[PDB]
Design a protein around this ligand. Sequence first.
Ligand SMILES: CC(C)C[C@H](CC(=O)NO)C(=O)N[C@H](C(=O)N[C@@H](C)C(=O)NCCN)C(C)(C)C
Ligand SMILES: [Zn+2]
Length: 254
Amino acid sequence: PDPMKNTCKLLVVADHRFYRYMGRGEESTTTNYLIELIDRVDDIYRNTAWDNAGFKGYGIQIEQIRILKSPQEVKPGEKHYNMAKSYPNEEKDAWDVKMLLEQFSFDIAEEASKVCLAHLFTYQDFDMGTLGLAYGGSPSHGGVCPKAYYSPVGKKNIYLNSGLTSTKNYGKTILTKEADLVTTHELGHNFGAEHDPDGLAECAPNEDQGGKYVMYPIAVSGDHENNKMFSQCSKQSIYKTIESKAQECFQERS
Ligand SMILES: CC(C)C[C@H](CC(=O)NO)C(=O)N[C@H](C(=O)N[C@@H](C)C(=O)NCCN)C(C)(C)C
Ligand SMILES: [Zn+2]
């Protein structure tokens, strides 16, 4: 473990929806929420022994918080992740999640190329209880350290070191304990973890064995012991990544 290359620095972005509905139209309220959430997620990462030995101390820290106070004005037929309307269906509260992650990665491309990860924090009710999305750890590429993807539609390179979290689900603000689990799961995909499968009991335990781990495909609730922790399956996947990636874009912990 290299102490000079053990931290994935983040570009955290709060859109106009997050600023209005979570930050009560205030910059201090917005940033405090985000700073505390990332610090709690960091506690899970930093304390995880990726090899079940001394390969721990790897975490995340915020490099910058971009605060989008108002919607992004767009020309007719032009789209932006911070625009007032949802896409592709303006009648819906939320964007289609896959299209929003692709749009955010397109719009943030220049900033994303200079950071370990970029994460969008929004407040929109994705269809069917979806809480977030991320690149990396998809059974498709991406995750930690900018990886270029030439977008034939966008006509430029976008980077796949991105993910997103919404703190709205089913018409209300999710609990902070639930929000921590969403961001951990999304960043888990970025770090290279795939979902925990039912077929491996060690990786998806019963409620009497501590419950499911953070990478389970169905959202926890956050009341069981395992809920906040990475399974041995996630650890094996991430351990392979960390080795191959820390030297590429990780920095010293501040
Ligand atoms: C933090 C969670 C695990 C993220 C996953 C989606 C995913 O794999 N993101 O990487 C999610 O939103 N899962 C939803 C989920 O379990 N949502 C819960 C909160 C829910 O609303 N369940 C409703 C039951 N009909 C799905 C897509 C399975 C509906
Ligand atoms: Zn997932």
